[PDB]
């Protein structure tokens with residue numbers, strides 16, 4: 129197995145593992161990634177009965193930056209960008225897996241584009257009447273946040289008395305999990321429960337109780353446009369959604385003790401051309417101003433070593449059933465038809 | 481036709497040209513020399529020297545096409561192949577040690593064998609002579625039965641009893657049933673071979 | 687062979703079909719023998735041209751860019767799409783369509799198959815760089831025009847035998863099929 | 868107003884205030900770099916955005932934030 133690496137601990141990967149696949153255990157899969165992985169990588173996991181990630185230069189660089197992070201300085205914003213289907217989401221997942229194994233508190237948003245389109249049950253927030261709530265989209269996130277960070281929900285404790293209704297309230301000093309539970313039971317209080325959680329995690333992490341990772345994929349959605357409408361068929365701005373408005377506060381580097389890692393995505397974007405991939409093009413003026421200063425990390429197509437190792441991984445799983453695919457002519461044809469693009473290569477190898 | 485009679489259809493086979501001059505017979509040598517003078521049509525969009533090219537699957541895709549939408553037809557075909565491959569992998573991982581030697585996971589093999597299991601050897605021809613139509617049996621040409629297999633598969637997968645099941649999932653299920661000599665299309669082949677046996681005396685009319 | 691009516695014109699005499707055939711059989715018998723120079727001229731008197739250039743596609747000349755890299759330019763047309771390709775003698779398989787990478791310009795796999803066809807036929811994938819500019823038509827028309835332009839430009843860097851093979855594969859012939867009125 | 872502008876003025880901008888606040892926070896936790904940072908930001912805001920400009924901006928920001 130030339131395409132695999134036995135070092136399955138992301139804290140010890142280095143430049144010598146570039147292009148080699150490391151395995152993620154089922155426990156780490158179900159704990160760290162209830163929602164993170166791309167929809168078409170989950171199919172590969174189910175079919176192969178294993179989740180193996182290739183180690184690449186983007187993720188290695190982003191891990192080397194996070195290892196040398198000073199937790200006294202304000203949180204740094206890292207933005208993964210690159211052409212469509214190049215591996216920025218899975219690099220983000222690699223970094224999330226590294227940070228979960230070092231007992232960070234993972235605040236992972238699988239796709240911020242889902243919160244700005246196709247919402248059927250849109251409400252008006254009782255906390256603030258000029259904002260809207262998305263109980264279905266917030267309660268869905270809360271369950272998986274509980275799954276990923278089940279351990280800390282009892283160690284962490286709120287620092288204010290939160291009022292859900294005249295009957296029901298959470299008192300100061302309660303475990304954070306209760307708040308999460310209150311959002312999971314009564315979806316009417318889901319969006320309010322998410323904000324409180326953020327308000328806690330950004331605050332207490334500064335005090336030094338834990339290290340916080342804010343991993344937001346498709347971050348370009350926050351400062352863009354929506355396809356959500358009121359009852360008078362008027363457009364709703366992203367800042368009028370409480371779920372989006374609370375997440376923008378996590379992006380500002382007015383806290384320390386954590387790192388902010390982001391990944392652009394034109395897939396699922398609204399009112400963006402297909403071939404736009406650069407940070408300004410996707411973020412917009414407002415988004416770039418919000419993130420500036422930030423470190424942009426470029427994700428590219430497979431280099432020849434990585435392409436050969438990916439095809440070797442597929443062959444070792446017996447996933448290329450065409451007889452001519454193993455040959456050299458078949459590899460040249462695959463390389464040309466994909467141009468070493470990981471997504472195109474995976475899609476073309478899917479039905480071969 | 482915008483092509484004149486002189487123009488001849490091209491030969492896209494990549495291995496044909498690489499065949500050595502020594503292996504050439506006198507007849508094939510003469511054909512090769514003659515072709516040089518002839519005018520050749522432009523190769524059409526479609527077939528290619530690619531090693532993955534499969535004429536049978538291309539024809540099936542062309543026959544699923546509606547209104548020139550070849551992108552959608554090819555998308556459906558590739559989704560069907562992917563679904564077949566995934567179902568076979570799923571069935572393979574849940575199999576015992578000895579049962580894993582008899583599970584096919586190559587989707588192209590399954591597709592070709594399924595279309596082979598549906599080909600009718602004989603058919604019927606409506607012929608009205610005595611004022612009453614008479615369905616006489618006839619043996620089909622290879623092209624005719626190859627076409628009929630595909631037409632029956634597509635018509636079966638377009639039947640409206642299959643309700644809101646998307647085309648790739650229906651087609652993969654039908655292909656995997658026909659792979660094991662089951663399903664309605666094999667029954668349609670058998671019930672034609674039976675209606676052509678119940679009329680083996682009318683053959684003389686032909 | 688000289689046809690009957692223009693033979694009559696040369697002779698200034700009306701002649702039948704059978705005597706024309708007899709004359710042509712004599713000419714063939716003379717050709718079979720070890721005819722000399724004067725005899726070959728005599729036979730040439732009675733043979734017009736129908737052109738042997740269908741054998742031979744026109745090879746573009748190799749030009750040199752200011753860096754000293756050798757390249758060749760060619761043009762092609764399909765429906766309303768018109769393409770001009772520049773093929774460099776040495777490259778790594780980088781195709782740029784209108785300044786864009788080919789996989790980004792042609793999302794559909796079929797068009798990439800079409801661009802792959804010419805280099806794949808002569809087993810020279812990954813051995814040239816292509817800079818093409820296409821205009822007009824649609825997706826498939828642009829793909830076909832580019833394919834023709836790359837084939838015509840690649841004719842410069844392959845053997846004459848491979849030029850003939852590409853011709854017989856339909857890779858160097860303009861497709862004349864267009865919308866009818 | 869800023870929306871009317873067709874050129875980017877770094878002075879008195881969101882970028883300038885953000886970087887000043889970040890550097891004040893770093894000093895509390897504890898120039899040519901700022902010149903190069905503003906050059907990169909002005910390039911990205913006025914000229915065409917290519918990967919070269921993005922990399923120049925990355926290096927400037929890394930030097931400002933002490934990331935290596």
Ligand SMILES: Nc1ncnc2c1ncn2[C@@H]1O[C@H](COP(=O)(O)OP(=O)(O)OP(=O)(O)O)[C@@H](O)[C@H]1O
Pocket residue numbers: 166168169180181182183184211212213214215216217218219392393394395470471474
């Ligand atoms: N590091 C990697 N390890 C394994 N497979 C990878 C890796 N990077 C990319 N791939 C392959 O590429 C496919 C698409 O990659 P990914 O989901 O990361 O896309 P992306 O770059 O985030 O793009 P998009 O804009 O579509 O979201 C993955 O499903 C997988 O097949």
Ligand SMILES: Nc1nc2c(ncn2[C@@H]2O[C@H](COP(=O)(O)OP(=O)(O)O)[C@@H](O)[C@H]2O)c(=O)[nH]1
Pocket residue numbers: 255256289290291292317319320321322323324325327370374
């Ligand atoms: N139902 C409820 N929600 C609260 C309460 N307090 C805070 N929240 C939510 O948690 C978030 C806290 O973030 P905050 O900084 O206060 O934003 P703010 O709206 O401008 O005040 C708010 O956006 C609210 O949505 C509370 O006492 N009751």
Ligand SMILES: [Mg+2]
Pocket residue numbers: 216217345392393395
């Ligand atoms: Mg993505």
